[PDB]
């Protein structure tokens, strides 16, 4: 997942959070990728598409 | 009245004496006494909630031999209770349309084929 | 079960743990261990004779163990089964060594040379193959399914030429000089051969 | 219409189908001749079914082999197995059984892995 | 036999030239038609054994319900018939009266085993093939249709090698290796 | 034995489907059993069916380890292979050494070029019972899969806080005697299933004074595995820690061997469901 | 650390709320349906 | 934000201490979850004898019908009395013999 964070520190702050696509596919962020900074690895209920947007509902 | 083993022995005293100290308690009752005893218990339990047209199904016997079965059984009943009446002997009391249950009733398994009473006359 | 032929007593009885029926056995030369194989279990059951216990269950055949024989000199076990495989087990002394020799078809009646050097197996193709045990390579075979007298039954509707009922040997045995093999099966010919030349010496009706 | 015979030779994942029939004497692996089978140092591994028994057995029959799978040495072992047991099966079915088991004896005295592969492995010690 | 009129059919009702009461509804004929049984007396040779099993099962259910003799022999007979293949489940002992049946002993015959193993397209084809001598159990060729195949002994029902049927299935998938004759 | 094992699994799952299908007759036969016991009237459904009572005459003589392990529970000792993933690192080879020392009747197999289908076939015709496949991540071992072989279950776990006996110190040699076991709060039916899986790979009947013990203590779906030796003093019992400690978490449990992944899943970790983190042995 | 603490406090809050709502539902059921059935019983006499 | 699952527990000295004294309680009470190594009546007697001979005949013809591939009887540690006698006398009727020992061993006499 590309750009909801600006740094791996930010993703480290937000690890384990539950996200979802706009299709309601639930998911969880797992680990920040190393070289592209705000990019991370998430796991979903099944295969999401390239035309989706993930969402971290915070308050 | 709420003793179970005592009342089971009381109402299965007849076929224990027909198919036999004596044994009466289950885990000691050998074959035909066991089959008819268990069948009698299951009938008496199932006659509460089960339907009366479905609990006591008679064995299908043809007309001209079931009527002869009934006539010879009633001849046995009349001869027995007449012999006891001309003797002193006090007999147990039956209802009005029922058959008197005798030793040939318990041995010959006659009530599966003829019922306890002619239910056409009971209905009318 | 074991029988003393002095006091005429069955002194030992060996069962398994799996309730199987045994079809062939093999004893040690130095009779410490009896061994037996079934046609419904794929294992070989290894019992001590001195105590009565089940010493081992050898596993590794993927077909019913048709025949067992202990080598009389070096005491190596040879089993052979309907998964087209003869197998050589070094049981004694820390080895637990298994050498599987594959063969062309499913084996019934292995037999063992008196010096334990070679093993002759009878196969369902109709052949008797002879293998060197220590260097597990075939020494030589006899092709026996064309000198077999297979008669015609009364009930069957196929000729004795085209029948596949009895053109193979279900029992073979070495001579005691190691040079010949007598063989018989479900047919009315028994044939004996000399294993150097692999040629039929004589056939008996 | 022709007397023909099909056999199979296998090593690790190579597999070779050999059709043997009566003919003029041509031995062709994958369309090309047998004298083109690379890696060219194992061409005698391919040749030894011919040189063990003589070319006068192959003077009247033509073989063709189709080899898929595997690597270089697994393919030459599949080729030699297919050729060997195809010659044995042809001499069984259409020539006499005495030449059949003479061929089996010669190949088995050289190595029986020309005729029977080593197939199912390992051993769980 | 001539479709009696109303007065005749009323006057002789019990007349039937085909179906009698001793026939038991022609069930020997019915299950021997189902499982293609050659000889007439195989139904009744199996019916004797079903009557043995059910006679023992009656006389064994007439024992008291807790003694180990009844429980051991009921379980032992149940295990034996499941292993032989007549019974399809060794769970309940009412199988020893209800589910023991000439059709179960007939489903264990060799052509029916064959047809269920997809080894022949019908039971009559399986009869023809094992009469023609194509089928071996284990190593030895089985020649008669009535052969009863137990549960562990149905793993070895194959064709004989050098069978034309084995050759044509191998050559249908062109896996025929002519080295081992098929 | 290919055809025998295929048709034996076929008959077993036929019998299991028939049990769950006709398991209503078991409990209504239980109802009429206790109706004979205390003379209380029988319901209408159990009162009007005549066939069930005349089967009950036959069926009045009817009456822990489960269906895969039940045949040979204490009869026969296990036989375990311990193998790594493929081309393993040296710390995974050290961990596989430690797991083969954990389980008695376990050997270790070198892994490389072993396909998992013919590995499973070689094991289940050479007679082994269990296979433990270990997976790593840069040294740190991350999973172990236990496959019980006569078409039994596979339990797949992840391993989480792994400290190794090779990693700590030369504290000596291990004990290798048949240990005692401890299972702490395995309370659900999945807990008993996992207990039976994890404990039918130890030898039956250790000595009563067998001086090593190994504990599988459940702490919210995180089975802490430690191994201890002990010697009972005058005042308590003194515990020393020996051999590896980790936390395994079951994420999958299916009903076939390792090769297929077409087997029916008994349980697997629903991670993304809405009420995921609210229950244990979920 | 905040993960474990927030999850377990949310679980505690949900398990308290479900108990509280089920309690008030069946107390309204029991101690007022007894009066509903009492009124129906003394209305059936009319 | 809400989070999906609880994190993996950190193993500190408190949880190792709690786990060790759990182990100590179990190990001093020997609470170990190990694997554990695996005449009547006249009428009842004659009922038993009748179904025994029925069972014998039925098992015989089931074996012969099954073409004697069967599964054997489970186990019976029976009890045999053998008297002592010459093994001449334990033989068949023919002119010869094979062994003239006594059927009981010296350590059985």
Instruction: With beta carbons less than 8 A apart as the criterion, state whether D112 and C137 touch.
Output: yes
Q: Which letter, b or e, does each residue of F167-192 get, where b requires 16 or more Cβ atoms within 10 Å of its Cβ?
A: eeeeeeeebeebbbbbbbebeeebbe
User: Is the four-CA dihedral E48, E49, E50, E52 of positive or negative sign?
Assistant: positive
Chain breaks in chain E (C to N over 2.5 A) after: none
Contact call for H and A: 3+ CB–CB distances under 8 Å: yes
Question: What is d(CA A43, CA A49) in angstroms, rounded to the nearest whole number?
Answer: 13
Alpha helices by DSSP H, listed for chain D, are: 43-51, 72-93, 97-110
How many angstroms separate the CA of residue E137 from the nearest CA in chain B?
Answer: 44
Question: What is d(CA E142, CA E110) in angstroms, rounded to the nearest whole number?
Answer: 9
Q: Give the DSSP letter string of F21-36.
A: HTTHHHHHHHHHHHHH
CATH number of domain containing D122: 3.30.230.10
Angle between helices E42-61 and E27-34 (to 10 degrees): 110
Nearest to E101 by CA among E154, E19, E23, E30: E30
Instruction: With beta carbons less than 8 A apart as the criterion, state whether F222 and F158 touch.
Output: no
Task: Give the residue carrying structure tokens 């637990």.
Answer: C96
Token couple for D64: 């063709």
Instruction: With beta carbons less than 8 A apart as the criterion, state whether A45 and A20 touch.
Output: no
Chains with 3+ CB–CB pairs under 8 A to D are C, E, F
User: Is the four-CA dihedral F280, G3, G4, G5 of positive or negative sign?
Assistant: negative
Hey, is the C-beta of H6 within 8 angstroms of any chain A C-beta? no
Task: Sort out which chain H residues have CB atoms less than 8 A from B28's CB and list them.
Answer: 41, 44
Hey, is the C-beta of C16 within 8 angstroms of any chain F C-beta? no
Half-sphere exposure of B11 (CA within 13 A, CB side): 14
Token couple for F262: 């077409």
Question: What is d(CA B39, CA B20) in angstroms, rounded to the nearest whole number?
Answer: 17
How many angstroms separate the CA of residue B65 from the nearest CA in chain H?
Answer: 35
Alpha helices by DSSP H, listed for chain A, are: 8-13
Separation of CA D110 from chain center = 14
The number of distinct structural domains making up chain D is: 1
Instruction: With beta carbons less than 8 A apart as the criterion, state whether F260 and F243 touch.
Output: no
Any idea what DSSP says for residue C30?
S
User: Is the four-CA dihedral D101, D105, D106, D111 of positive or negative sign?
Assistant: positive
Nearest to E175 by CA among D17, D80, D85: D17
Question: What is d(CA F181, CA F172) in angstroms, rounded to the nearest whole number?
Answer: 22
Token couple for G17: 């709320």
Resolution (in Å) of the shown entry? 4.1
How many angstroms separate the CA of residue H8 from the nearest CA in chain A?
Answer: 11
Hey, is the C-beta of C42 within 8 angstroms of any chain F C-beta? yes
Question: What is d(CA E88, CA G9) in angstroms, rounded to the nearest whole number?
Answer: 55
Any idea what DSSP says for residue E180?
G
CB-CB: which of B27, B28, B34 is closest to E62? B34
* Secondary structure (3-state) at H38: coil
* Secondary structure (3-state) at C178: coil
Question: What is d(CA D111, CA D99) in angstroms, rounded to the nearest whole number?
Answer: 18
Task: Sort out which chain H residues have CB atoms less than 8 A from E77's CB and list them.
Answer: 55, 58
Task: Give the residue carrying structure tokens 């015609």.
Answer: C152
* Secondary structure (3-state) at H77: coil
Q: Give the DSSP letter string of F71-102.
A: TTTTTS---EEEEESSS--HHHHHHHHHHHHH
Neighbouring CB atoms inside 10 A of F210's CB total 17
Question: What is d(CA F11, CA F18) in angstroms, rounded to the nearest whole number?
Answer: 10
Instruction: With beta carbons less than 8 A apart as the criterion, state whether A27 and A18 touch.
Output: yes
Hey, is the C-beta of B57 within 8 angstroms of any chain F C-beta? yes
Domain that holds residue D99: 1-125
Q: Please judge whether H32 and F236 are an interchain contact, meaning their C-beta atoms are less than 8 angstroms apart.
A: no
Angle between helices D72-93 and D97-110 (to 10 degrees): 150
Token couple for F83: 């193998």
Question: What is d(CA H59, CA H72) in angstroms, rounded to the nearest whole number?
Answer: 11
Token couple for H60: 């015989």
Q: Please judge whether F18 and E92 are an interchain contact, meaning their C-beta atoms are less than 8 angstroms apart.
A: no
**Residue F151 CB partners (closer than 8 Å, separation 6+):** F5, F8, F9, F12, F68, F256, F257
Task: Sort out which chain H residues have CB atoms less than 8 A from E156's CB and list them.
Answer: none
Looking at the DSSP bridge assignments, the partners of residue C132 are C118
- State yes or no: cis peptide before B49, omega within 30 of 0: no
Backbone torsions φ then ψ of F80, nearest 5 degrees: -120, 135
- The torsion defined by the Cα of H90, H92, H96 and H102, in degrees rounded to 10, comes to 0
- State yes or no: cis peptide before G24, omega within 30 of 0: no
Q: Give the DSSP letter string of chain F.
A: -HHHHHHHHHHHHHHHHHHHHTTHHHHHHHHHHHHHHTT-PPPSHHHH-HHHHHHHHHHTT-----TTTSTTTTTS---EEEEESSS--HHHHHHHHHHHHHSTTEEE---SS--HHHHHHHHHHHT--EEEEEEEETTEEEEEEEEETTT--EEEEEE-S-B-HHHH--------S--EEEEE---SHHHHHHHHHHHTTS-S---TT--EEEEEEESSS-EEEEEEEEE--SSS-EEEE-S-BEEEEEEEEESS-SS-S-SPEEEE---SSTTGGG-S--
* Secondary structure (3-state) at C182: strand
Angle CA G17–G21–G22, to nearest 5: 115
Separation of CA D17 from chain center = 9
* Secondary structure (3-state) at C40: coil
Any idea what DSSP says for residue B26?
T
């Amino acid at each position: 997942i590309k750009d909801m964070f600006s740094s791996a520190m930010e993703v480290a702050r937000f690890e384990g959070a539950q996200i979802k696509t706009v299709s309601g596919i639930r998911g969880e962020i797992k680990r920040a990728l190393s070289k592209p900074e705000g990019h991370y690895r998430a796991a979903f209920e099944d295969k999401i598409l390239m035309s989706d947007i993930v969402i971290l509902r915070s308050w | 009245q709420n003793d179970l083993e005592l009342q089971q022995f009381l109402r299965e005293s007849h076929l224990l004496s027909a198919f036999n100290g004596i044994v009466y308690q289950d885990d000691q009752v050998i074959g035909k006494a066991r089959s008819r005893t268990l069948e009698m218990r299951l009938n008496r339990l199932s006659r509460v909630n089960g339907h009366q047209d479905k609990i006591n199904k008679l064995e299908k016997v043809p007309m001209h031999i079931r009527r002869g079965m009934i006539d010879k059984h009633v001849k046995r009943i009349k001869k027995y209770e007449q012999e006891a009446a001309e003797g002193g002997i006090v007999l147990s009391k039956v209802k009005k349309g029922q058959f008197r249950k005798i030793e040939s009733t318990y041995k010959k398994d006659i009530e599966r084929r003829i019922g306890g009473s002619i239910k056409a006359r009971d209905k009318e | 079960r074991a029988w003393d032929l002095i006091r005429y007593r069955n002194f030992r009885t060996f069962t398994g743990t799996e309730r199987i029926q045994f079809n062939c056995l093999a004893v040690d030369p130095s009779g410490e261990v009896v061994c037996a194989g079934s046609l419904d279990n794929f294992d070989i059951h290894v019992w001590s004779v001195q105590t009565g216990q089940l010493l081992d269950a050898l596993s590794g055949h993927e077909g019913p163990v048709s025949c067992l024989s202990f080598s009389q000199e070096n005491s190596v076990l040879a089993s052979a089964s309907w998964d087209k495989t003869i197998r050589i087990w070094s049981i004694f002394g820390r080895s637990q060594q298994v050498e599987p020799i594959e063969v062309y078809s499913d084996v019934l009646a292995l037999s063992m040379r008196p010096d334990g050097k070679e093993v002759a197996v009878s196969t369902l193709k109709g052949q008797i193959s002879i293998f060197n045990i220590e260097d597990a390579k075939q020494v030589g075979n006899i092709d026996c399914r064309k000198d077999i007298i297979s008669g015609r039954f009364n009930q069957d509707r196929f000729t004795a030429k085209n029948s596949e009922r009895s053109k193979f040997f279900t029992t073979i045995h070495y001579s005691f000089d190691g040079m010949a093999i007598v063989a018989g099966g479900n047919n009315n010919s028994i044939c004996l051969y000399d294993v150097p030349n692999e040629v039929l010496l004589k056939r008996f009706i | 219409a022709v007397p023909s015979v099909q056999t199979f030779g296998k090593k690790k994942s190579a597999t070779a189908v050999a059709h043997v029939k009566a003919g003029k004497g041509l031995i062709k692996v994958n369309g090309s001749p047998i004298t083109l089978v690379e890696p060219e140092i194992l061409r005698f591994k391919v040749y030894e079914p011919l040189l063990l028994v003589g070319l006068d057995k192959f003077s009247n029959i033509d073989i063709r082999v189709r080899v898929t799978g595997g690597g270089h040495v697994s393919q030459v072992y599949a080729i030699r197995q297919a050729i060997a047991k195809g010659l044995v099966a042809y001499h069984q079915k259409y020539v006499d059984e005495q030449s059949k088991n003479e061929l089996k004896k010669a190949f088995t005295s050289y190595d029986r892995t020309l005729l029977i592969a080593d197939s199912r492995r390992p051993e769980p010690k | 036999v001539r479709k009696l009129k109303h007065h005749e059919q009323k006057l002789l009702k019990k007349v039937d030239f085909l179906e009698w009461k001793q026939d038991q509804g022609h069930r020997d004929t019915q299950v021997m038609r189902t499982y293609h049984i050659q000889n007439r007396e195989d139904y009744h040779k199996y019916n004797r054994i079903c009557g043995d099993i059910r006679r023992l099962a009656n006389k064994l259910s007439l024992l008291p319900p807790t003694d180990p003799f009844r429980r051991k022999h009921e379980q032992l007979l149940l295990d034996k018939l499941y292993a032989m293949g007549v019974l399809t489940t060794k769970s309940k002992i009412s199988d020893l009266e209800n589910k023991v049946t000439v059709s179960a002993i007939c489903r264990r015959r060799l052509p029916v085993i064959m047809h269920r193993l997809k080894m022949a397209e019908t039971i009559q084809d399986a009869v023809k093939f094992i009469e023609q001598g194509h089928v071996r159990v284990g190593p030895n060729l089985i020649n008669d249709p009535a052969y009863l195949v137990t549960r562990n002994m149905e793993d070895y029902v194959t064709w004989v090698d050098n069978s034309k049927i084995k050759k044509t299935l191998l050559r249908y998938r062109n896996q025929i290796d002519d080295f081992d004759f098929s | 034995m290919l055809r025998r094992q295929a048709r034996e699994r076929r008959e077993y799952l036929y019998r299991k489907a028939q049990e769950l299908q006709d398991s209503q007759l078991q409990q209504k036969r239980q109802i009429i059993k206790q109706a004979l016991a205390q003379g209380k009237p029988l319901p209408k459904e159990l009162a009007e069916d005549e066939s069930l009572q005349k089967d009950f005459r036959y069926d009045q003589s009817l009456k822990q380890v489960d269906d895969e392990y039940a045949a040979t529970s204490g009869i026969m000792d296990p036989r375990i292979i311990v193998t790594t993933s493929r081309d393993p690192s040296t710390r995974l080879s050290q961990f596989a050494k430690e797991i083969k020392l954990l389980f008695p009747n376990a050997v270790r197999l070198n892994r490389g070029n072993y396909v998992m289908p013919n590995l499973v076939d070689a094991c289940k015709k050479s007679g082994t019972t269990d296979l433990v496949v270990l997976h790593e991540h840069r040294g740190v071992p991350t999973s172990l899969t236990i496959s019980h072989f006569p078409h039994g279950p596979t339990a797949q776990f992840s391993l989480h806080n792994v400290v190794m006996r090779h990693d700590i110190i030369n504290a000596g040699n291990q004990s290798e005697v048949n240990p005692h076991l401890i299972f702490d709060n395995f309370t659900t039916a999945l807990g008993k299933r996992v207990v039976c899986i994890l404990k039918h790979l130890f030898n039956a009947g250790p000595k009563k004074d067998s001086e090593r013990v190994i504990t599988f203590a459940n702490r919210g779906d995180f089975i802490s595995v430690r191994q201890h030796v002990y010697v009972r003093t005058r005042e308590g019992v003194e515990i020393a820690e020996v051999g590896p400690r980790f936390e395994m978490r079951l994420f999958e449990l299916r009903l076939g061997t390792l090769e297929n992944k077409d087997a029916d899943v008994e349980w697997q970790l629903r991670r993304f469901i809405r009420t995921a983190n609210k229950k244990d042995y979920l | 650390f905040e993960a474990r603490q927030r999850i377990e406090e949310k679980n505690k809050e949900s398990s308290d709320y479900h108990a509280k709502m089920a309690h008030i539902v069946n107390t309204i059921n029991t101690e007022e349906g007894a009066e509903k059935n009492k009124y129906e019983r003394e209305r059936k006499l009319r | 934000f809400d989070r999906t699952a609880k994190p993996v527990p950190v193993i500190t000295s408190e949880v190792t201490e709690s786990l060790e004294d759990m182990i100590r309680r179990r190990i001093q009470d020997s609470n170990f979850d190990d694997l554990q190594r695996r005449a009547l009546s006249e009428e009842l007697q004659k009922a038993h004898s009748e179904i025994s001979e029925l069972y014998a005949n039925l098992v015989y013809k089931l074996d012969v019908l099954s073409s004697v591939h069967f599964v054997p009887k489970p186990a019976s540690t029976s009890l045999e009395i053998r008297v002592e006698t010459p093994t001449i006398s334990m033989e068949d009727a023919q002119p010869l013999y094979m062994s003239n020992a006594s059927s009981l061993a010296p350590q059985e006499i």
